[PDB]
Ligand SMILES: Cc1cc2nc3c(=O)[nH]c(=O)nc-3n(C[C@H](O)[C@H](O)[C@H](O)COP(=O)(O)OP(=O)(O)OC[C@H]3O[C@@H](n4cnc5c(N)ncnc54)[C@H](O)[C@@H]3O)c2cc1C
Ligand SMILES: Cc1cc2nc3c(=O)[nH]c(=O)nc-3n(C[C@H](O)[C@H](O)[C@H](O)COP(=O)(O)OP(=O)(O)OC[C@H]3O[C@@H](n4cnc5c(N)ncnc54)[C@H](O)[C@@H]3O)c2cc1C
Ligand SMILES: NC(=O)c1ccc[n+]([C@@H]2O[C@H](COP(=O)([O-])OP(=O)(O)OC[C@H]3O[C@@H](n4cnc5c(N)ncnc54)[C@H](OP(=O)(O)O)[C@@H]3O)[C@@H](O)[C@H]2O)c1
């Protein structure tokens with residue numbers, strides 16, 4: 006018989022479990038699945054907590070979400086393929102669900118799946134080794150509930166431990182003497198803290214955009230964002246100037262590359278994350294940049310230096326839930342032997358290279374979206390996963406992109422066509438800038 | 451030769467290296483020494499950084515110190531018996547040096563000791579296992595300069611990783627929703643942030659004492675401190691007040707056991723730390739409360755379930771630097787063979803029980819001080835550690851305590867007798883509450 010260890014109970018690990026349970030429904034025998042989760046409850050990033058730094062058990066807080074956060078993409082872009090919205094909420098909702106709403110939705114199908122009984126919560130994995138003679142992986146985990154660490158052999162390890170949790174926190178001259186709050190996005194929690202204040206937001210990507218907005222919505226005196234590469238470029242509110250790279254701080258004085266100046270009360274470092282695995286030896290440890298074509302993963306899921314070990318979700322993410330399903334099915338199939346991996350490490354490296362180069366062929370954002378779209382499509386064709394209208398996802402993604410470039414601060418006040426009934430979403434009872442309440446029930450009436 | 455691995459290059463780990471160096475200079479054979487240090491530099495808690503949470507490498511920030519921190523005790527009670535403050539600084543400085551100053555003193559000693567060549571920085575330990583059949587420990591460490599993990603065998607392991615870095619962070623009702631800053635002391639860095647605010651300081655121990663005082667010195671609008679057991683009991687300033695146990699928060703308003711009420715702008719959790727070792731298996735992982743009689747440590751230093759493993763600094767601390775020394779010399783001598791461990795585990799366990807029982811014989815403060823004094827005497831008598839006036843050091847704490855009950859806010863404007871000379875240190879050039887500059891240059895003029 007076989008046993009498989011899944012590290013993480015975020016959307017990815019959860020997707021993996023759904024994958025095995027699905028095959029077992031159909032009538033397939035499956036190996037024992039053990040899923041280790043560090044937190045007390047499933048949901049990965051979506052499992053919000055006020056904590057920052059180390060959690061109550063002393064482990065580093067995984068959560069990177071803050072209050073007042075709504076879906077960054079239209080929900081129509083992420084709608085599951087085996088369980089849809091209305092089926093869980095009963096009704097049609099607006100196009101940008103708040104965190105709680107989406108968490109409840111993520112919760113919906115996982116509960117319905119009866120997978121929870123596979124998850125060991127409060128159980129950070131401490132280490133994973135591979136013995137070539139047994140052909141077994143040895144996972145080592147600490148059970149916080151009983152304060153005891155133990156070890157166990159598995160035939161496979163599927164690492165679903167995320168990569169938007171270990172922050173890149175760069176030092177700039179003046180940071181250690183700045184008389185104000187300096188915080189990475191991983192630790193940002195409540196925008197009310199910056200009400201009436203002058204915020205500096207470093208970065209030009211998703212977090213800078215959304216965290217900047219949050220603080221604008223909740224009353225910052227002003228927003229200053231700064232880029233080091235391409236500006237976010239959107240049409241910013243009155244209190245929002247975008248500026249070139251920081252040189253240094255002197256007091257509360259930000260000096261920028263164009264010689265200009267601004268005094269700010271607070272700095273939110275929206276400078277991204279690293280793929281970091283504290284629990285992996287060199288010959289298992291994935292090392293890569295954040296991007297659509299992840300180094301060292303054949304088919305974007307199988308570890309080239311040891312193909313009995315897998316990784317989910319390690320790509321940068323235009324597509325999310327639907328991708329992790331596509332990935333999890335594939336990894337499932339490879340484990341059940343419906344799919345046979347190459348024994349030729351050269352050829353697995355070839356596959357990665359090809360992905361990298363194709364990814365690099367164009368820098369246009371619609372090309373990039375389309376690209377991960379072709380990826381999902383690739384995967385879904387190679388397993389019994391329900392083929393679905395991905396191009397329909399893409400078309401939503403394209404409308405999204407036109408709404409943000411249109412009016413960055415109102416883009417969440419739009420609706421998009423559904424992909425299962427082509428029916429364009431209703432509007433929300435309330436405008437985003439007015440919708441100060443965050444709660445699920447406020448959203449749902 | 452034998453090899454010994456030292457975990458940590460703070461004061462205890464550094465004391466341990468000095469110990470081994472001193473022995474070898476005198477011409478005793480010594481095992482090879484490898485000291486693994488997480489941080490970029492030595493210093494342990496005294497190596498300050500602005501960072502909180504995870505460090506530039508993704509490892510948890512060890513630092514628990516803040517800006518404007520000064521020695522909370524008389525420098526007289528911690529002076530290296532083999533390296534006087536006079537030998538280092540050349541003159542005679544006041545009794546409560548700022549962080550930077552004592553840091554330079556710690557570094558001064560290991561400078562002269564030429565032991566830095568033994569230290570591997572940016573190299574946190576990942577794991578320690580013992581194998582009884584080879585009678586060697588296996589140490590897995592990760593080198594962030596080469597981003598490479600490796601494993602090596604050692605005949606002894608001396609863990610000096612400290613226990614004031616992994617915080618105890620309780621949940622109280624309303625923490626999830628408080629409109630303001632909630633920060634544990636371990637993440638606290640700059641008191642200026644609290645200028646003008648009604649601060650809530652939870653706790654009644656050293657941390658709440660000092661951090662509350664920093665907040666007040668640097669202009670907090672008001673301080674409220676709450677206890678769950680015994681009030682701190684000091685004659686506080688007029689804008690400072692102690693309340694019984696917090697029950698909950700409602701918006702910005704705190705509720706205490708006495709049914710009273712106060713609105714607060716920020717909460718600093720000075721609720722302490724845990725003994726936490728993310729890198730040890732059940733069979734080597736010290737588990738103990740923070741006190742003077744540490745559990746499962748023979749002579750306060752040798753893990754009783756495997757006495758080839760030792761631990762430094764795990765006790766609560768009145769005495770600090772020279773205790774670390776006594777311990778370091780002891781452990782050294784036990785490893786060299788100048789001391790023999792009891793063949794009977796019952797004996798080691800017996801030794802720990804008598805220490806607990808004697809710590810518990812009385813709850814009076816002077817008696818605790820004397821108790822730790824006796825431990826240092828006990829240890830010192832068994833090695834060739836330089837003798838030094840322990841009683842005198844003890845009288846320094848007795849006067850220190852007196853000065854604190856007399857004036858909790860000025861106790862640092864005081865001098866004490868050198869354990870070597872007997873004469874009162876010079877007065878510093880500025881009252882503490884006015885000494886806003888904490889630099890080593892301002893201090894030494
Ligand atoms: C701030 C933020 C906002 C986002 N918003 C959106 C959005 O609106 N829409 C969208 O589609 N996508 C969004 N994403 C993308 C997000 O990554 C995915 O939606 C999804 O949460 C990732 O799935 P995952 O399970 O692979 O990663 P994670 O959600 O990070 O799951 C990893 C899980 O593994 C666990 N784990 C980690 N290490 C260990 C260990 N050693 N032992 C045991 N368990 C461990 C963690 O507890 C965690 O629960 C957002 C990401 C971030 C950072
Ligand atoms: C806020 C605060 C203020 C204090 N002020 C004073 C004072 O004024 N006077 C005084 O006498 N005492 C003070 N103390 C007590 C303090 O514990 C000692 O001064 C001293 O720092 C103890 O030294 P140590 O080496 O035992 O522990 P630490 O100083 O904590 O040293 C531990 C070292 O081990 C390293 N380490 C940890 N884990 C790993 C790993 N897995 N791999 C590799 N390396 C690792 C850490 O990076 C760290 O450098 C204070 C303590 C605190 C928390
Ligand atoms: N529904 C979703 O899937 C969803 C969408 C939004 C966010 N996200 C995911 O998470 C990622 C985006 O979140 P993110 O913004 O937090 O990460 P990020 O994409 O890596 O953005 C990092 C930003 O910080 C800048 N930066 C990095 N290091 C810096 C430094 N040392 N100094 C100054 N600036 C620096 C970057 O500039 P440079 O460009 O020059 O590096 C970049 O603008 C996406 O890639 C995405 O997959 C999830």
Ligand SMILES: NC(=O)c1ccc[n+]([C@@H]2O[C@H](COP(=O)([O-])OP(=O)(O)OC[C@H]3O[C@@H](n4cnc5c(N)ncnc54)[C@H](OP(=O)(O)O)[C@@H]3O)[C@@H](O)[C@H]2O)c1
Pocket residue numbers: 522523618620635652653654655656657658678679680720721722723740765766767768769
């Ligand atoms: N050389 C010196 O100047 C000097 C002298 C005195 C002490 N010390 C040292 O410095 C250390 C103290 O630092 P510290 O104050 O940060 O830690 P600490 O001594 O453990 O103090 C913790 C405080 O928080 C309280 N607390 C703990 N858990 C709580 C919870 N869940 N809810 C509410 N309150 C809670 C404690 O109350 P309870 O007591 O009820 O648990 C205590 O008041 C000691 O370990 C000691 O070594 C130094």
